[PDB]
Scaffold this active site. Structure first.
Site, PDB file in Angstrom:
ATOM      1  N   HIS A 117      63.116  35.596  17.115  1.00 42.61           N
ATOM      2  CA  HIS A 117      63.979  36.494  16.349  1.00 42.61           C
ATOM      3  C   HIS A 117      63.060  37.473  15.568  1.00 42.61           C
ATOM      4  CE1 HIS A 117      67.373  37.429  13.497  1.00 42.61           C
ATOM      5  NE2 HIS A 117      66.383  37.449  12.624  1.00 42.61           N
ATOM      6  N   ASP A 193      60.339  28.283  12.163  1.00 39.07           N
ATOM      7  CA  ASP A 193      61.616  28.954  11.895  1.00 39.07           C
ATOM      8  C   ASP A 193      62.748  28.085  12.421  1.00 39.07           C
ATOM      9  OD1 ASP A 193      64.018  30.480  11.981  1.00 39.07           O
ATOM     10  OD2 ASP A 193      63.110  31.967  13.340  1.00 39.07           O
ATOM     11  N   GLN A 196      68.307  28.347  13.410  1.00 36.46           N
ATOM     12  CA  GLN A 196      69.394  27.999  14.339  1.00 36.46           C
ATOM     13  C   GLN A 196      69.503  26.536  14.677  1.00 36.46           C
ATOM     14  OE1 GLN A 196      72.376  28.339  16.905  1.00 36.46           O
ATOM     15  NE2 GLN A 196      72.810  28.920  14.759  1.00 36.46           N
ATOM     16  N   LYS A 219      74.205  29.452   7.943  1.00 36.10           N
ATOM     17  CA  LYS A 219      74.347  29.030   9.348  1.00 36.10           C
ATOM     18  C   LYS A 219      74.822  27.596   9.457  1.00 36.10           C
ATOM     19  CE  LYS A 219      71.336  32.650  10.995  1.00 36.10           C
ATOM     20  NZ  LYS A 219      70.831  33.182  12.233  1.00 36.10           N
ATOM     21  N   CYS A 359      69.045  40.577  17.500  1.00 37.08           N
ATOM     22  CA  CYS A 359      67.769  40.644  16.769  1.00 37.08           C
ATOM     23  C   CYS A 359      66.586  39.984  17.533  1.00 37.08           C
ATOM     24  CB  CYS A 359      67.930  40.060  15.336  1.00 37.08           C
ATOM     25  SG  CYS A 359      69.162  40.838  14.223  1.00 37.08           S
TER      26      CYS A 359
END
Lengths: 400, 397
Positions: A117, A193, A196, A219, A359
């Site tokens: 991303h 990261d 998600q 999220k 993105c």
């Protein structure tokens, strides 16, 4: 985990569930009423700033804020003081780049995945361009699967490795335990990261060998907007240079200079989003009452039927065929239609889906495609919703 | 304009019935209607943002754009000059990092001596780091600036950074005048409006502001986690975004990145959509009341508070000229440590801050242990001040 009914009992708490089929969960989750009730009791019954103020409202606020931080620590298997609140993942990631930039000698190397991303590459691009570093990407296929050998090779020598836990566009669950071992083995700092994955599946700092970790409350954790987390392992408290500095971050000041305070308040400049953090903790409570295990299975189940149905219909979809490596997100395209047109057609049928580059333009480029359409799930999504989706897709496809 | 009785307003704030909240410079109490605005985002149109095709993202985006436009108009700025942050301190730090590339060793920055750590440390670090001259405008212990010493320190500095109001003392600095000087001398002018923003008129043009920061959780009666950074149009090709990624780009590849137009160029990641909408609800609520009426009510509160403390002969601080005193009054009880005074007020359902207050060269300036701070907003009432004086009376004996 208090044994109760998936997806209906979660649906009971989210009014939008009666109004639309929300398959846009990687963009942001829907939010249960208890998360919004927990925030409303802050704002209307114990509204105050934190920083251990004497009066009774501030005691409460402060208590509640630190409770929130302990809950966020325990969710991720970290220590209280290792947790930093930020506005989002993107902030958290930029803070890692800006925090550690002074360590980098010119010609040092950083390595990431190609699928990142935008917020987990272009901070590393800026930093590379700025300092004369080598920014290297590990090979992998169009399906999202990393070449682990090439990883072991490319990671050898790096001062820093940054990787997404799952891709927002392909749904690849990368093998970040393996990736972490390898970075630990080779000396490098490992930054993960987890935007998600957080809320959808186990994210634990110990297992993942992480030195830095970022996620967003809006999220999978079913929290509000404006609340990210940055994990910073104890080890780095005397290397990491607080990027934001100001109120709440000192033990003495003068017109001459300053002396900073302890973590985690060292890294938290100004009035935090106390409201957000309390919302976030309620989200995590909500999540751990359901169970990461049960959330995983729902999602996996919705993906299986979605992918089978799209197979039936001659509709191509992206990411791992091996569904054990596929998170609750399935990107796809209808040949002959632009993704924005597919998504408008679904929106006409009250089905919410994202379209475009997500993105992650590099991903789109590695596949040679002008964007995708993206259906993404959470535990409140149902098989009926999937079926009615495949229904309109079917009407769509044989209208071509 | 228009059209209501102060203090009610109280009618929308349930906590106003349980306590007397005199800790408004820390954070404001929040009206039901602001919380209601956020709740409809979270429960009735929850989504990102980034003009996504589905009707929820349409709605959310529209409402987020609306939110920015409302903030813009509140401070007389253009849509694209407003960037959202988590708080004032992020905004100010972002100014420090966003044009550290324009300084050269021996360039001078000028501040006020007072002066919130968030409008200090990012200047102290940026000076140490780049070898810069950091100079303080002169003022007395009431907090009134010497405008002569202003004129000679602004000549010839790269930038000037001032509080609009002190959170310790409550001085309103004469920033339309400082802006004039900075403008005339060609310095970049940065204004910390964390205490003025929902209590008095703040207007980027009137102020000659190039950068401006404020927080939604203070005077604008908004939620936490939402801040504003104003960047004047003229600095778009100079100012480099210290935070970049999602939502910040026209194109990206593995080679590099091209950045997007403002304001979105400076806004990395999913913004706090909720907080933005809430902040807009707040300023809507403030405009409905009127900033002039807010100024007047706070002024009555300060008038009765200070004249009652004079009556009790307890020392208080900041400008004796009430024209130049915001709705905050720092005071002390001789021979009582401020935390004990605050502990005692709390026992009487009276909420009040004590200590250094993220100010401190003030606590040295002005050498003293610390201070107890009562601060106000439009929802506070004279009768609340009156009962506060009553417990102060009892305590003084």
């Amino acid at each position: 985990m208090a044994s109760m009914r998936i997806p209906e009992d979660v649906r009971k708490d989210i009014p939008l569930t009666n109004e639309v089929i929300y398959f846009d969960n990687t963009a942001t989750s829907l939010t249960p009423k208890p998360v919004v009730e927990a925030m409303d009791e802050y704002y209307l019954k114990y509204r105050a700033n934190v920083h251990r103020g004497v009066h009774r409202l501030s005691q409460m606020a402060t208590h509640k804020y630190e409770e929130s931080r302990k809950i966020v620590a325990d969710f991720i298997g970290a220590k209280f003081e290792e947790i930093v609140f930020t506005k989002n993942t993107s902030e958290s990631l930029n803070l890692v780049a800006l925090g550690l930039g002074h360590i980098f000698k010119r010609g040092d190397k950083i390595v990431t995945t190609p699928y990142e991303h935008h917020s987990d590459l272009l901070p590393w691009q800026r930093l590379a361009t700025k300092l004369g570093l080598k920014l290297e990407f590990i090979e992998g296929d169009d399906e999202g699967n990393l070449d682990l050998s090439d990883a072991e090779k490319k990671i050898k020598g790096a001062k820093l490795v940054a990787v997404q836990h799952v891709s927002n566009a392909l749904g690849v669950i990368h093998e970040v335990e393996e990736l972490g071992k390898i970075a630990k083995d080779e000396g490098a700092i490992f930054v993960v990261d987890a935007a998600q994955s957080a809320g959808h599946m186990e994210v634990n700092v110990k297992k993942l060998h992480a030195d830095f970790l970022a996620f967003s409350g809006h999220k999978g954790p079913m929290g509000p907007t404006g609340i990210g987390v940055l994990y910073i392992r104890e080890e780095f408290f005397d290397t990491f240079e607080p990027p934001l500095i100001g109120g709440g971050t000192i033990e003495d000041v003068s017109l001459d200079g300053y002396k900073l305070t302890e973590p985690p308040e060292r890294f938290e400049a100004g009035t935090p989003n106390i409201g957000g953090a309390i919302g976030l903790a309620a989200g995590i409570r909500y999540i751990e009452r359901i169970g990461l295990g049960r959330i995983e299975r729902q999602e996996h189940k919705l993906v299986k039927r979605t992918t089978e149905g799209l197979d039936e219909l001659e509709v191509p979809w992206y990411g791992p065929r091996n569904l054990k490596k596929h998170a609750g997100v399935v990107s796809f395209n209808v040949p002959g239609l632009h993704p924005h047109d597919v998504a408008a057609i679904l929106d006409d049928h009250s089905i919410m889906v994202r379209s475009g580059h997500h993105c992650a333009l590099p991903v789109m480029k590695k596949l040679g495609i002008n964007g995708t359409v993206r259906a993404s799930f959470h535990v409140y999504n149902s098989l009926e919703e999937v079926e009615t989706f495949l229904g309109v897709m079917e009407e769509l496809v044989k209208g071509l």
